[PDB]
Amino acid sequence: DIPDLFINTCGASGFEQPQNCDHNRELDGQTGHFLKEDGTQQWTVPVTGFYRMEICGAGGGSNSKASGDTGDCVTLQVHLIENLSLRMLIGQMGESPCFTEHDDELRPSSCSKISHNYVYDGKRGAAGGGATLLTVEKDLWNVVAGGGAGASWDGFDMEVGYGASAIHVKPDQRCNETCKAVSHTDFIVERRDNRCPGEKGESTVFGGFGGGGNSCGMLGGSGAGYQAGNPFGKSRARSGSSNVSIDFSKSPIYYQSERLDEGYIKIAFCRKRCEPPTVCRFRKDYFEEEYCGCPDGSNVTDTEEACAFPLVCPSSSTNQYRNFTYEPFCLCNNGKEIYDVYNDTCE
Numbered sequence: 001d002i003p004d005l006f007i008n009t010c011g012a013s014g015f016e017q018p019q020n021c022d023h024n025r026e027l028d029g030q031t032g033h034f035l036k037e038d039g040t041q042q043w044t045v046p047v048t049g050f051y052r053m054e055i056c057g058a059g060g061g062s063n064s065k066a067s068g069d070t071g072d073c074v075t076l077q078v079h080l081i082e083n084l085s086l087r088m089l090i091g092q093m094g095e096s097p098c099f100t101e102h103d104d105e106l107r108p109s110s111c112s113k114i115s116h117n118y119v120y121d122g123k124r125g126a127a128g129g130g131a132t133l134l135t136v137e138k139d140l141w142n143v144v145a146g147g148g149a150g151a152s153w154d155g156f157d158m159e160v161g162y163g164a165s166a167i168h169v170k171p172d173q174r175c176n177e178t179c180k181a182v183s184h185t186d187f188i189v190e191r192r193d194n195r196c197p198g199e200k201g202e203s204t205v206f207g208g209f210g211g212g213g214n215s216c217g218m219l220g221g222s223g224a225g226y227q228a229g230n231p232f233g234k235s236r237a238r239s240g241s242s243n244v245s246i247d248f249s250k251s252p253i254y255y256q257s258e259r260l261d262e263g264y265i266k267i268a269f270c271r272k273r274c275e276p277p278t279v280c281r282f283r284k285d286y287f288e289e290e291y292c293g294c295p296d297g298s299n300v301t302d303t304e305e306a307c308a309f310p311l312v313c314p315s316s317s318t319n320q321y322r323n324f325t326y327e328p329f330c331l332c333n334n335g336k337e338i339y340d341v342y343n344d345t346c347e
């Protein structure tokens, strides 16, 4: 009997990754969740069944004039097998323009929401939020939830960076020398990476862990995402996009967070006790309702024998379901998957 999980930032914000979570090393009794040394977080599925996830990117940093943009969220339902390992990056909010008392004088600096040394405000853009990522097989991010752009200040210039992206992005015509110099390439970025070139180096405002865009001027850094926000766009165009690999969830819901916060992943257990062959599944708006039904999602009322395989497989092929979407399909003995038409066969 386990409560819903809330995979969070462990008190970390801004550029610096999490350092201390509940568990930092794996246990064997309730192996559960723990923090890796690269800033990602592992979780071992404890019970085979349907899970409802909410995956939210981090919001943009804020300046004395304006609040950052909220991260992007995706809510999905996915069937998970016990002992499967999920690796995740929880995006963190972008930092803010400040000054620090270095030596006996005040230099421009970047300040996170958990900064102990923030007393003086700066008059420039703030940085973008990091995206929030989930990988099943640790070869690509099956889920990317976009982060929000940072707060812009009053003016305009081209001294601003894109957040990180999963896939290629053709940048905006206004992304020139500086923008290309400071734009992030991957979500996992190191300290010296993408400071503003030259004199504006100290004035760099760092996007949050998860690839939040830096800023070097008045514009807020764009949010990271499947494709990063456009620093030159209007409204949500500045914030990152989200995508879910269709090999992971059939019907994900994408929406904008109602709050300016760090990233996080909510994992909900399906708790309704269900009479076989029906299992617990979610269906209302945003999967907020648990119900008993055929795991493939079909009505039990189709025929006298509930949850019967709805496909007739051909020749050298057996009866299967897809490990995550529970989509009915036909495994061909030569490797080939006929999760396809009446037409298709085993070559």
Ligand SMILES: *[C@@H]1O[C@H](CO[C@@H]2O[C@@H](C)[C@@H](O)[C@@H](O)[C@@H]2O)[C@@H](O[C@@H]2O[C@H](CO)[C@@H](O[C@H]3O[C@H](CO)[C@@H](O)[C@H](O[C@H]4O[C@H](CO)[C@@H](O)[C@H](O)[C@@H]4O)[C@@H]3O)[C@H](O)[C@H]2NC(C)=O)[C@H](O[C@@H]2O[C@@H](C)[C@@H](O)[C@@H](O)[C@@H]2O)[C@H]1NC(C)=O
Pocket: 173, 174, 175, 176, 177, 180
């Ligand atoms: C920072 O922006 C500079 C200002 O120019 C921009 O104009 C357009 C393109 C738009 O992006 C705008 O917002 C920018 O302000 C960039 O410099 C300029 O770069 C272009 C190439 O992108 C230069 O191109 C000329 O060169 C010869 C002249 O005869 C032509 O062949 C070119 O025509 C085009 O040819 C093809 C037609 O199908 C196709 O490749 C493009 O449509 C070409 O435009 C073109 O007239 C242009 O002269 C130049 N303008 C000025 C005022 O300097 C600047 O740098 C550039 O950076 C990259 C993209 C490289 O191509 C550089 O060699 C080039 O100098 C850009 N910097 C950065 C880092 O982004």
Ligand SMILES: *[C@@H]1O[C@H](CO)[C@@H](O[C@@H]2O[C@H](CO)[C@@H](O)[C@H](O)[C@H]2NC(C)=O)[C@H](O)[C@H]1NC(C)=O
Pocket: 226, 227, 241, 242, 243, 244
């Ligand atoms: C999520 O991913 C899929 C593929 O990774 C995207 O689909 C493509 O969309 C373009 C048109 O917009 C098609 O012409 C391509 O052929 C599609 N590719 C594939 C492989 O199907 C989808 O649009 C992505 N969603 C977002 C919001 O980025």
Ligand SMILES: *[C@@H]1O[C@H](CO)[C@@H](O[C@@H]2O[C@H](CO)[C@@H](O)[C@H](O)[C@H]2NC(C)=O)[C@H](O)[C@H]1NC(C)=O
Pocket: 081, 084, 323
């Ligand atoms: C998905 O469903 C299949 C059902 O056959 C599971 O398959 C097995 O996977 C492991 C590989 O780690 C091996 O024991 C065999 O390759 C498979 N077993 C048999 C009896 O064929 C698979 O484990 C399920 N889950 C995942 C996450 O892939």
Ligand SMILES: *[C@@H]1O[C@H](CO)[C@@H](O[C@@H]2O[C@@H](C)[C@@H](O)[C@@H](O)[C@@H]2O)[C@H](O)[C@H]1NC(C)=O
Pocket: 291, 292, 293, 298, 299, 300
């Ligand atoms: C097909 O979908 C549902 C079957 O799961 C039908 O509705 C429900 O059936 C049970 C699972 C039970 O939880 C009911 O309270 C629930 O409403 C649904 O009515 C049917 N669709 C149509 C169009 O008839």
